[PDB]
Every structure is written in structure tokens, then in C-alpha cells.
Design an enzyme around this catalytic site. Structure first.
Site, PDB file in Angstrom:
ATOM      1  N   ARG A  91      44.727  41.233  40.612  1.00  0.00           N
ATOM      2  CA  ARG A  91      45.565  41.191  39.542  1.00  0.00           C
ATOM      3  C   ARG A  91      46.062  42.814  39.219  1.00  0.00           C
ATOM      4  O   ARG A  91      47.153  42.745  38.570  1.00  0.00           O
ATOM      5  CB  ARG A  91      44.765  40.766  38.282  1.00  0.00           C
ATOM      6  CG  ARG A  91      44.280  39.043  38.718  1.00  0.00           C
ATOM      7  CD  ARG A  91      43.769  38.593  37.313  1.00  0.00           C
ATOM      8  NE  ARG A  91      44.737  38.884  36.163  1.00  0.00           N
ATOM      9  CZ  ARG A  91      45.632  37.984  35.721  1.00  0.00           C
ATOM     10  NH1 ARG A  91      45.696  36.774  36.180  1.00  0.00           N
ATOM     11  NH2 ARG A  91      46.594  37.881  34.808  1.00  0.00           N
TER      12      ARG A  91
ATOM     13  N   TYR B  43      40.919  49.157  38.636  1.00  0.00           N
ATOM     14  CA  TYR B  43      40.654  47.773  39.190  1.00  0.00           C
ATOM     15  C   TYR B  43      39.533  47.968  40.370  1.00  0.00           C
ATOM     16  O   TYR B  43      39.161  48.905  40.767  1.00  0.00           O
ATOM     17  CB  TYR B  43      41.968  47.254  39.624  1.00  0.00           C
ATOM     18  CG  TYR B  43      42.030  45.635  39.993  1.00  0.00           C
ATOM     19  CD1 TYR B  43      41.471  44.852  38.837  1.00  0.00           C
ATOM     20  CD2 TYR B  43      42.357  45.231  40.987  1.00  0.00           C
ATOM     21  CE1 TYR B  43      41.412  43.256  38.912  1.00  0.00           C
ATOM     22  CE2 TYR B  43      42.240  43.696  41.205  1.00  0.00           C
ATOM     23  CZ  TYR B  43      41.601  42.986  40.197  1.00  0.00           C
ATOM     24  OH  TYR B  43      41.707  41.642  40.345  1.00  0.00           O
TER      25      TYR B  43
ATOM     26  N   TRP C 208      37.112  32.667  40.893  1.00  0.00           N
ATOM     27  CA  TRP C 208      36.989  33.795  41.817  1.00  0.00           C
ATOM     28  C   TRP C 208      35.523  34.604  41.834  1.00  0.00           C
ATOM     29  O   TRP C 208      34.912  35.160  42.717  1.00  0.00           O
ATOM     30  CB  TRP C 208      37.835  35.039  41.316  1.00  0.00           C
ATOM     31  CG  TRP C 208      39.114  34.555  41.452  1.00  0.00           C
ATOM     32  CD1 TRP C 208      40.049  34.136  40.353  1.00  0.00           C
ATOM     33  CD2 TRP C 208      40.024  34.521  42.719  1.00  0.00           C
ATOM     34  NE1 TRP C 208      41.250  33.735  40.663  1.00  0.00           N
ATOM     35  CE2 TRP C 208      41.421  34.074  42.299  1.00  0.00           C
ATOM     36  CE3 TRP C 208      39.625  34.716  44.005  1.00  0.00           C
ATOM     37  CZ2 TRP C 208      42.181  33.823  43.166  1.00  0.00           C
ATOM     38  CZ3 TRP C 208      40.645  34.498  45.123  1.00  0.00           C
ATOM     39  CH2 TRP C 208      42.063  34.039  44.359  1.00  0.00           C
TER      40      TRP C 208
HETATM   41  C1  LIG Z   1      34.244  38.023  42.786  1.00  0.00           C
HETATM   42  O1  LIG Z   1      35.192  39.086  42.246  1.00  0.00           O
HETATM   43  C2  LIG Z   1      36.228  38.755  42.283  1.00  0.00           C
HETATM   44  C3  LIG Z   1      36.958  38.611  43.427  1.00  0.00           C
HETATM   45  C4  LIG Z   1      38.137  38.364  43.682  1.00  0.00           C
HETATM   46  C5  LIG Z   1      39.001  38.248  42.522  1.00  0.00           C
HETATM   47  C6  LIG Z   1      40.422  37.947  42.274  1.00  0.00           C
HETATM   48  C7  LIG Z   1      41.142  37.783  43.602  1.00  0.00           C
HETATM   49  C8  LIG Z   1      43.012  37.833  43.294  1.00  0.00           C
HETATM   50  O2  LIG Z   1      43.320  38.061  44.398  1.00  0.00           O
HETATM   51  N1  LIG Z   1      43.182  37.116  42.292  1.00  0.00           N
HETATM   52  C9  LIG Z   1      44.445  36.966  41.865  1.00  0.00           C
HETATM   53  C10 LIG Z   1      45.539  37.204  42.859  1.00  0.00           C
HETATM   54  C11 LIG Z   1      46.912  37.097  42.556  1.00  0.00           C
HETATM   55  C12 LIG Z   1      47.227  36.824  41.079  1.00  0.00           C
HETATM   56  C13 LIG Z   1      46.250  36.276  40.550  1.00  0.00           C
HETATM   57  C14 LIG Z   1      44.878  36.481  40.620  1.00  0.00           C
HETATM   58  C15 LIG Z   1      43.877  36.058  39.712  1.00  0.00           C
HETATM   59  O3  LIG Z   1      42.667  36.179  39.854  1.00  0.00           O
HETATM   60  O4  LIG Z   1      44.332  35.715  38.603  1.00  0.00           O
HETATM   61  C16 LIG Z   1      38.264  38.549  41.122  1.00  0.00           C
HETATM   62  C17 LIG Z   1      37.113  38.633  41.064  1.00  0.00           C
HETATM   63  O5  LIG Z   1      36.530  39.300  39.845  1.00  0.00           O
HETATM   64  C18 LIG Z   1      36.472  38.095  39.003  1.00  0.00           C
HETATM   65  N1  LIG Z   2      44.303  37.750  32.144  1.00  0.00           N
HETATM   66  C1  LIG Z   2      43.681  39.075  32.524  1.00  0.00           C
HETATM   67  C2  LIG Z   2      42.270  38.427  33.235  1.00  0.00           C
HETATM   68  C3  LIG Z   2      41.234  39.974  33.313  1.00  0.00           C
HETATM   69  C4  LIG Z   2      40.208  39.586  34.511  1.00  0.00           C
HETATM   70  O1  LIG Z   2      39.589  38.296  34.249  1.00  0.00           O
HETATM   71  N2  LIG Z   2      39.925  40.346  35.305  1.00  0.00           N
HETATM   72  C5  LIG Z   2      38.730  40.113  36.085  1.00  0.00           C
HETATM   73  C6  LIG Z   2      38.822  41.008  37.560  1.00  0.00           C
HETATM   74  S1  LIG Z   2      40.441  40.115  38.278  1.00  0.00           S
HETATM   75  C7  LIG Z   2      37.274  40.871  35.445  1.00  0.00           C
HETATM   76  O2  LIG Z   2      37.805  42.041  34.552  1.00  0.00           O
HETATM   77  N3  LIG Z   2      36.476  40.303  35.538  1.00  0.00           N
HETATM   78  C8  LIG Z   2      35.110  40.947  35.403  1.00  0.00           C
HETATM   79  C9  LIG Z   2      34.037  40.436  34.667  1.00  0.00           C
HETATM   80  O3  LIG Z   2      34.577  39.676  33.820  1.00  0.00           O
HETATM   81  O4  LIG Z   2      33.258  41.140  34.462  1.00  0.00           O
HETATM   82  C10 LIG Z   2      44.314  40.215  33.264  1.00  0.00           C
HETATM   83  O5  LIG Z   2      45.333  39.645  33.892  1.00  0.00           O
HETATM   84  O6  LIG Z   2      44.214  41.259  33.285  1.00  0.00           O
END
Ligand SMILES: COc1ccc(/C=C/C(=O)Nc2ccccc2C(=O)O)cc1OC
Ligand SMILES: N[C@@H](CCC(=O)N[C@@H](CS)C(=O)NCC(=O)O)C(=O)O
Ligand SMILES: N[C@@H](CCC(=O)N[C@@H](CS)C(=O)NCC(=O)O)C(=O)O
Lengths: 198, 198
Positions: free
Chosen positions: B13, B7, B103
Site C-alpha cells: 500500500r 511502511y 493478506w
Molecule cells: C502479512 O502481512 C502483510 C502481507 C502483505 C500485505 C499486502 C500486500 C499488498 O501488496 N497489498 C496491496 C497491493 C496493492 C494494492 C493494494 C494492496 C492492499 O493490500 O490493499 C499486507 C500485510 O499486512 C496486512
Molecule cells: N485503507 C488503509 C489500510 C491500512 C492497512 O490495513 N494497512 C496494513 C498494512 S498493508 C496494516 O497497517 N496492517 C497491520 C495491522 O493491522 O496491525 C490504507 O490504505 O492505508
């Protein structure tokens, strides 16, 4: 066990529960409500959302939580704990994508533009991931049907309402829909269920 | 079994999986990647999302799918069939809210606005629903800690980063957080874990 399901008059987030009840030959009350009766019912609900399933009077909520509860200890769940993980993952992948749609959007032009862009870019990307993941196999997970196959048929049925040619280049995903629809408890349910757009 | 979790360098997550590994006293490689390396890893993954968990050469995906796999037949799972449904349901309610946050949003001004609205207009209601749901019980589900308690503590921690006053009117939810944080395996992980904003 006395089961009662409550949702709107639509497939939506309740359909997965309905397929499961149908496939496992479990009787239940398919209670459908109209907008007018939502505020009364809603207020009695701890989280204010449907679907809910009442089991011998005890209320359950969250559609995927309920779907999983109903498939527990059945072959629809996945044959191993590892397969159950893959089943849960595919279901979540589909749900994450289905959640991108602005179903509630009031501005019709915005709704149309967003649907078109999700269906033009994201949907074909997901379809390729799903198609390569299934490969030439019979079912998404393991060697027997799981509720992940059900969910796929369900989500794709709704996506095809808006982009009918979505699966035109994915014959293996069409074949998967046809295999699911052909299961007799499913073919029966599909025939007698109320006809709604969503 | 050999476990390798991949991750970003964030709780995000992956954190629910980390708490579960900690509580169950399982060793795993906690692999954390930089943004600049993401696009490269993303392209080799069946669904292009993290976290992923590798077990003996088998990739697993979807944080909740993985969390559920890891807690199955452990004391972190609900005690009854129905209690496991409630664990799933609470987790999904919390996940449904956390997913609303943009996010990744590029536009800072738009992102801040979104965050502010969700935290100011929506979060208070979830807290109210959760507080009533918990009532005067010790844990969210049943008589012992479940991974739903872990998830509540994890989600609330992140929400409190952006809105510190979120639980001022909810002492029982503050108490539950404190109670989760007091669990020896959890307290040890919280103390030793990399300290990131998210
Ligand atoms: C900009 O990149 C970033 C920056 C931050 C995050 C997410 C941080 C976070 O604490 N997420 C969560 C925490 C707890 C539960 C659920 C989530 C959930 O997201 O569903 C993801 C990214 O990638 C998309
Ligand atoms: N429901 C999925 C969501 C997965 C997800 O959107 N993770 C993000 C990071 S928190 C990700 O891989 N995003 C990067 C991208 O889209 O390139 C899970 O719980 O793993
Ligand atoms: N993830 C939840 C979502 C629940 C949900 O948002 N249900 C909708 C109907 S599709 C609802 O009750 N929203 C209208 C409202 O809250 O008033 C589930 O699958 O049960």
C-alpha cells in the site's frame, strides 16, 4: 446541472451523497430501485455497481469518489489541502471498518456471530481511536463541518441499529452526531427521507 | 518540506506514494520496518495502520488519502473536475478488489484457498470491466497519465505474482502497464527499488 442518483431504497452507500446534495442546496433526482429492476440497470453499468450519479447524462460511479466530487471547492471539503487529506483519511478509516461487515451473508447464524464479534471487539477499539482523535474539538477536522463529520454520523447511525449502546461511553461522539443532525439542511433531510433499516 | 514515509519492506500500500514521489521528483525518507517492530509503532498511532506519511511533524494516514494529497494540483490529477472523479473512482474500484485479499491471514491453507478463489473467480471480471472501460484510449482517464494509471500498474503487478496468466486475453491492459513502466521517473524507480515479492 441536472443530477440523477441511482441506488436501492436505503441509506447505505448513497446516504453520504444525499447529505451533501442536501447541505449544498443542490437539487437532484433521488432515484431508488427495487431488486427486480437491478439486472436491467446493472448490465448498462461499466462496473456493475451502485450508487451511480448521472450528471447532464454522464455517469459517475463510486460513492466516495462522487461525494468528493460534489464537495470540491466547498467548505465541506476541508479548508486546506492538508485538511482535505485528514478528511479523506477519516472517511477511508470508517469505510474500511464498515466493509468488515458481512452484509450479504446468507447464513443468518454466521451473520449474527460475525456482527457480534465485530461489534464487541473491533467497534469499541475504533470508537476509542475516533474519540481521542476528535478530542474536545468541535468537528473531526479543522474548525468547520466537513463531509467526514457527515460520514461519521451516517456510519454510526447504522452501527447503532445493531449495538444501541455502542456510544454509551463516548459522549463526545454522541455530541458529534447531534451537531451533524442539527445542521438545518441535514435535520430537514433526515425528517423527509424514506425510513429504512439500513 | 521534509517527507518520511513509514511502511513494511514491501511495495504493498505504500507503492502508490513512492511512484508519486518519484514522478514528482520529491526526496523523502523511505522508512521500512520489520514485523517484530510493528506492534510497538502501531500503539503510538492515532489509527494503528500504515503507511503513514510525516510532513514537517504532522502525521498523515491512509495510502489513498496521502496519494490524493500529493497529486493535488499536479499533472497526475485529472484534467477536469469530472476527470478527477473518474481518477478517484478507478482507484477505488481497484482498491475494493485488493482489500478482499486476506493478506494477514494466519491459517495458510485458508489463506491460499481465499487467494485462489478471488484470483480465479473474481479477478477475471475486473479485468474485463477495466479493458472495456479503457477501450482504445491511451490512458484510463483522459488524454494524459494520472495516478489511476500508476495504481492499475501497481495492483496488476501484485496480482500477476499470483496469477501470471491474468492478462493473456487483455493486450490493451498489458500495453497500459508497459506504458506506465516506460515513464522515465517510473522506470528509474522500478529499476532501483528494493525487490520484494509484494
Ligand atoms: C502479512 O502481512 C502483510 C502481507 C502483505 C500485505 C499486502 C500486500 C499488498 O501488496 N497489498 C496491496 C497491493 C496493492 C494494492 C493494494 C494492496 C492492499 O493490500 O490493499 C499486507 C500485510 O499486512 C496486512
Ligand atoms: N485503507 C488503509 C489500510 C491500512 C492497512 O490495513 N494497512 C496494513 C498494512 S498493508 C496494516 O497497517 N496492517 C497491520 C495491522 O493491522 O496491525 C490504507 O490504505 O492505508
Ligand atoms: N465501494 C463501492 C461499492 C459499490 C457496491 O458494492 N455497491 C453495491 C450496493 S451497496 C452493489 O451494487 N453490489 C451489488 C452488485 O454488485 O450486484 C461504492 O461505494 O460505490
Amino acid at each position: 446541472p441536472n443530477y440523477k442518483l441511482t441506488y436501492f431504497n436505503m441509506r447505505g452507500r448513497a446516504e453520504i451523497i444525499r447529505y451533501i446534495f442536501a447541505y449544498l442546496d443542490i437539487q437532484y433526482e433521488d432515484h431508488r430501485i427495487e431488486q427486480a429492476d437491478w439486472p436491467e440497470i446493472k448490465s448498462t453499468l461499466p462496473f456493475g455497481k451502485i450508487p451511480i450519479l448521472e450528471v447532464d447524462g454522464l455517469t459517475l460511479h463510486q460513492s466516495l469518489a462522487i461525494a468528493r466530487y460534489l464537495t470540491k471547492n466547498t467548505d465541506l471539503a476541508g479548508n486546506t489541502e492538508m485538511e482535505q487529506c485528514h478528511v479523506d483519511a477519516i472517511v477511508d478509516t470508517l469505510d474500511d471498518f464498515m466493509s468488515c461487515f458481512p452484509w450479504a451473508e446468507k447464513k443468518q447464524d454466521v451473520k449474527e456471530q460475525m456482527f457480534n464479534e465485530l461489534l464487541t471487539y473491533n467497534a469499541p477499539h475504533l470508537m476509542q481511536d475516533l474519540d481521542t482523535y476528535l478530542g474536545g474539538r468541535e468537528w473531526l477536522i479543522g474548525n468547520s463541518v466537513t463531509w467526514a463529520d457527515f460520514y461519521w454520523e451516517i456510519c454510526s447511525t447504522t452501527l447503532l441499529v445493531f449495538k444501541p449502546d455502542l456510544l454509551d461511553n463516548h459522549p463526545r461522539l454522541v455530541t458529534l452526531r447531534k451537531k451533524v443532525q442539527a445542521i438545518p439542511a441535514v435535520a430537514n433531510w433526515i425528517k423527509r427521507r424514506p425510513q429504512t433499516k439500513l
